[PDB]
């Protein structure tokens, strides 16, 4: 079982610096594309920039502010850094390690859906 502990994202005013650490403890096989999502209180869940092994970052609608996100495969760690902030960025952020690489899986639904969610943390903007 792959468990992604996510810690960080404490409360801060606009423009503050927030650091988040996502560590994927488990079997070393199929450890890739430790991407990010966020679920806003009572709203839709959106895909944050997803970083995979090989220094490949895919950006989407949830790339508000300035994320600097970098992952290390030696200890399965992902460091995310928000240096700006907006009032609409308050949400529960999550870190997910899926065997899907760089968001690609042209194969069966079992392989595609094989996945490992985690715990996440709450990010609040005043």
């Amino acid at each position: 079982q792959v468990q992604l502990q996510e810690s960080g994202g404490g409360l801060m005013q606009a423009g503050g610096s927030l650091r988040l650490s996502c560590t994927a403890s488990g079997s070393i096989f199929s450890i890739n594309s430790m991407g990010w999502y966020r679920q806003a209180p009572g709203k839709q869940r959106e895909l944050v920039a997803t970083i995979t092994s090989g220094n490949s970052i895919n950006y989407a609608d949830s790339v508000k502010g300035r994320f600097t996100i970098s992952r290390d495969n030696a200890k399965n760690t992902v460091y995310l850094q928000m240096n700006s902030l907006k009032p609409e960025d308050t949400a529960v952020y999550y870190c997910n390690a899926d065997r899907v690489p760089n968001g690609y899986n042209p194969w069966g639904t079992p392989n595609d859906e094989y996945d490992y969610w985690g715990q996440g943390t709450q990010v609040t903007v005043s």
């Binding site: 090989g54 065997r99 690489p101 760089n102």
Partner: peptide, 17 residues
């Protein structure tokens, strides 16, 4: 398409996948 090449030319974790 990330690779964007006829040959996959995918990075190792991708190709190894």
């Amino acid at each position: 398409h990330p690779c964007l090449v006829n040959f996959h030319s995918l990075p190792e974790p991708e190709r190894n996948y």
